[PDB]
Ligand binder design. Structure first.
Ligand code: MG
Ligand code: ZN
Ligand code: ZN
Lengths: 208, 7, 264
């Protein structure tokens, strides 16, 4: 049944551009969990269904990934490291709580949290994550996971009644992101409902 | 019945 | 209050009763209004239980106003169309001037003559009040003073008044009591359907500033009309005829949606 999920995300990558979102219009809220939207551009007229939580979350998440400077623990005695890979070590390390002094590398600060421990395996993970484009928003899995939970907890809840103003912001915000088809947990943000091409509606009132 | 207007 | 002893109205009420779709009527009786999809094509989205429907409200309002007309026949309230501004009056001859095929004063006068001779009944039965400002025979001075008030909180747009008069004068079979009565109720219902609002491009810098806020205002007035006046009435009293199944379309269902959209 997962093929129906794949073709949905495949359709979105071709049918929906960054600008397409800015021109989308909110129809209303469906079952207190969905935003029904229209998109009419050129000869294309389609309805899309947006998940209010997942779409709000993908925005908050991507914002945290790009802007947040993670808090670090200023080390008591600096620790060295050997690489090769040395040319990769970018101020993406400073954003991830790695203040450095630059095989002769010097680790001045390590990121810290009251709910998790950070090590050299995370610094090397971030060294390998750059190997796999935009590199300024790259985060080590530990940090990424924490931002994914921050976004999930702060975002619009399913079952929350929303007004046009809020729903409009939620949809339009998606134009700021690259291919925002999924939330950080891999859940879909939106899907195409139907194309409104040939709907020959009632017109008797203008007929003579 | 029938309408007065239609006679 | 007036009891309709008439045989014509009863036959038309029975005809409505014979077309009632039980299941489709339940869908409207328990609708949960979502919003407007297209103000031009007149499509609205509603939720019924686990399904999302696309409705053609042009078609639904048509049957709704037709049904209201049938029920309140000879007991309608009035929408008084006249102000202290005499220049704002609605002249039937002036309305028929929108039709280029009525290329002579006489052809427009032909239509006004039929309508005008039937003014006593149009007023009594339908609350469609016509008045003459000058001498009785001056068809060019025949005016529309009142229209029937079908729904409290609703005043129809008068953009379609030319069509109302043209069809009253050309489409209504004035010779047969039942066909005439049905015809007038159909004309009232047609005029009463909210207007088609064509799409205007808000992104186009080529289109004027005043044309924008004016489209936005028409877009808002319908959304508010459908949401606060129309759909609550549809939900409360609408009897769905079987010929309307083509106008109600299931577009999504929660069981299917919840197989793609899942919790984080
Ligand atoms: Mg039901
Ligand atoms: Zn979440
Ligand atoms: Zn998520």
């Amino acid at each position: 049944e997962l093929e129906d999920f794949e073709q949905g995300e495949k359709y979105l990558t071709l049918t929906v551009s960054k600008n397409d979102f800015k021109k989308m219009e909110v129809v209303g809220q469906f079952n207190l969990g969905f935003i029904i939207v229209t998109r009419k551009v050129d000869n294309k007229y389609d309805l899309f269904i947006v998940d209010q939580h997942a779409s709000d979350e993908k925005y908050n998440f991507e914002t945290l990934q790009a802007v947040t400077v993670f808090k670090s623990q200023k080390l008591i005695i600096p620790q060295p490291v050997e690489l090769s890979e040395l040319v990769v070590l970018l101020p993406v390390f400073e954003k991830n709580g790695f203040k450095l002094k630059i095989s002769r590398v010097k680790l001045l600060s390590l990121p810290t949290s009251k709910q998790t421990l950070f090590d050299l395996g995370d610094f090397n993970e971030l060294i390998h994550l750059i190997k796999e484009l935009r590199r300024d928003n790259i985060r080590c899995s530990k940090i990424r996971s924490m931002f994914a939970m921050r976004a999930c907890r702060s975002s619009i809840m399913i079952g929350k009644p929303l007004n046009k103003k809020t729903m409009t912001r939620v949809v339009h915000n998606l134009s700021e992101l690259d291919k925002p088809w999924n939330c950080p947990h891999g859940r879909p943000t939106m899907r195409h409902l139907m194309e409104l091409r040939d709907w020959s509606s009632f017109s008797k009132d203008y007929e003579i | 019945t029938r309408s007065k207007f239609f006679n | 209050r007036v009891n309709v002893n008439l045989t014509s109205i009863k036959k038309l009420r029975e005809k409505v009763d014979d077309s009632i779709h039980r299941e489709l009527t339940d869908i409207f009786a328990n609708l949960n209004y979502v919003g407007v999809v297209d103000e031009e094509r007149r499509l609205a989205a509603i939720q019924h239980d686990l399904k999302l429907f696309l409705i053609d409200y042009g078609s639904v309002c048509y049957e709704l106003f037709y049904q209201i007309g049938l029920t309140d026949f000879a007991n309608f309230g009035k929408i008084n169309l006249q102000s202290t501004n005499v220049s704002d009056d609605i002249v039937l001859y002036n309305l028929l001037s929108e039709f280029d095929e009525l290329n002579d004063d006489a052809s427009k006068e032909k239509i006004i003559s039929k309508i005008w001779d039937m003014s006593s009944m149009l007023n009594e039965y339908y609350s469609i009040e016509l008045v003459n400002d000058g001498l009785d025979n001056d068809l060019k001075s025949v005016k529309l003073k009142s229209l029937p008030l079908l729904l409290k909180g609703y005043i129809p747009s008068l953009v379609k008044l030319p069509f109302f008069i043209y069809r009253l004068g050309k489409e209504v079979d004035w010779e047969d009591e039942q066909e005439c009565l049905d015809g007038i109720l159909r004309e009232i219902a047609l005029l009463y359907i909210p207007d088609m609002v064509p799409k205007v491009d808000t992104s186009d810098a080529s289109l004027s500033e005043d044309e924008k806020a004016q489209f936005i205002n028409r877009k808002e007035h319908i959304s508010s009309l459908l949401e606060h006046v129309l759909f609550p009435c549809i939900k409360r009293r609408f009897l769905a005829p079987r010929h309307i199944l083509k106008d109600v379309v299931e577009i999504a269902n929660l069981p299917d949606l919840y197989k793609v959209f899942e919790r984080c």
